[PDB]
Design a protein around this ligand. Structure first.
Ligand code: NA
Length: 301
């Protein structure tokens, strides 16, 4: 279950002053691809320059696969006791009662260390820990009911035009699976309840305009094949796949920020993957480089 590549039993990377040990780097995590633990860590190391700004401050849930994606992996919200103290934790009060300590990935060392701990996919809050109930992202999470990319691509364009028509900045990323997130950056002046009411009301208006096409029906059977305008990530405690996060799918696809024009150049949500994304970055640059400069507020409050 190796692709031997000359690695030592343990490689030590030196990132931002921290020694990060990568044990068994030639262990295969993607069996159809021969993508090893080391190659995954190297992906997160080179992508860190663009990804760190997009995940810093966010409570992060880890989807870890110590034996690769062909075997069972797990979600983990409570930070491991053995993570070094320089890996930031956020202290969160559970609605249950009591507290949870989640990782916050505030720098490249942390990102690389989490990859070395077999994190494949990071999932992050729509808010940052210094104002954890006040999102800086509004997400519409679009998946096609027919598993056809054109279905989600056309919905994403219409939704973008509807938000652009109201005066909002609209950003976009693939999820590296089947879907797209349409994203409005926010200035953190409204709390989640306000943002989510907006998102639901917007979805409701869009549904009334295109009633055979879109739905906000919460029950899957009532949808009757219409695309769900999923506003439900806009709550405290919800996560979305991190921008530049790897999915646990063959080919190692990446949830990639893309421009609206680029949406027509691609063929599907898994267009970019750890092995072809560097060519993309070289040619196109980070589509979300200025996302936070466009941070805005909900109109008519
Ligand atoms: Na939100």
């Amino acid at each position: 279950g190796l692709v031997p590549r000359g690695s030592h039993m343990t490689e030590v990377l030196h990132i931002e002053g921290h020694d990060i040990k990568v044990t068994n780097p030639d262990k295969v995590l993607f069996p159809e691809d021969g993508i090893t633990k080391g190659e995954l860590v190297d992906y997160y190391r080179r992508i860190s320059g663009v990804m760190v700004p997009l995940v810093r401050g966010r409570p992060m849930t880890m989807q870890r696969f110590p034996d690769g994606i062909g075997k069972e992996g797990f979600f983990q919200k409570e930070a491991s006791d053995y993570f070094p103290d320089w890996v930031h934790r956020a202290t969160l009060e559970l609605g249950k009662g009591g507290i949870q300590h989640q990782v916050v990935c505030d720098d490249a060392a942390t990102l690389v260390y989490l990859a070395s701990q077999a994190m494949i996919t990071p999932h992050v809050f729509l808010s940052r820990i210094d104002k954890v109930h006040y999102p800086d992202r509004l997400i519409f999470d679009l998946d096609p009911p027919d598993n056809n990319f054109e279905t989600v691509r056309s919905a994403a364009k219409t939704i973008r035009e509807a938000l652009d028509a109201e005066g909002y900045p609209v950003y976009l990323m693939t999820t590296g699976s089947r879907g797209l997130h349409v994203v409005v950056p926010l200035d953190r002046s409204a709390d989640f309840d306000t943002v989510r009411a907006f998102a639901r009301g917007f979805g409701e208006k869009l549904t009334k305009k295109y009633p055979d096409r879109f739905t906000i029906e919460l029950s899957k059977e009532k949808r009757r094949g219409r695309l769900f305008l999923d506003y439900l990530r806009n709550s405290y405690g919800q996560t979305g796949v991190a921008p530049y996060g790897v999915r646990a799918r063959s080919g190692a696809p990446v949830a990639t920020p893309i421009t609206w024009d680029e949406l027509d150049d691609i063929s599907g949500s898994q267009e970019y993957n750890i092995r072809n994304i560097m060519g993309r970055m070289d040619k196109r640059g980070d589509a979300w480089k200025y996302i936070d400069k466009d941070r805005t507020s909900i109109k008519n409050l």
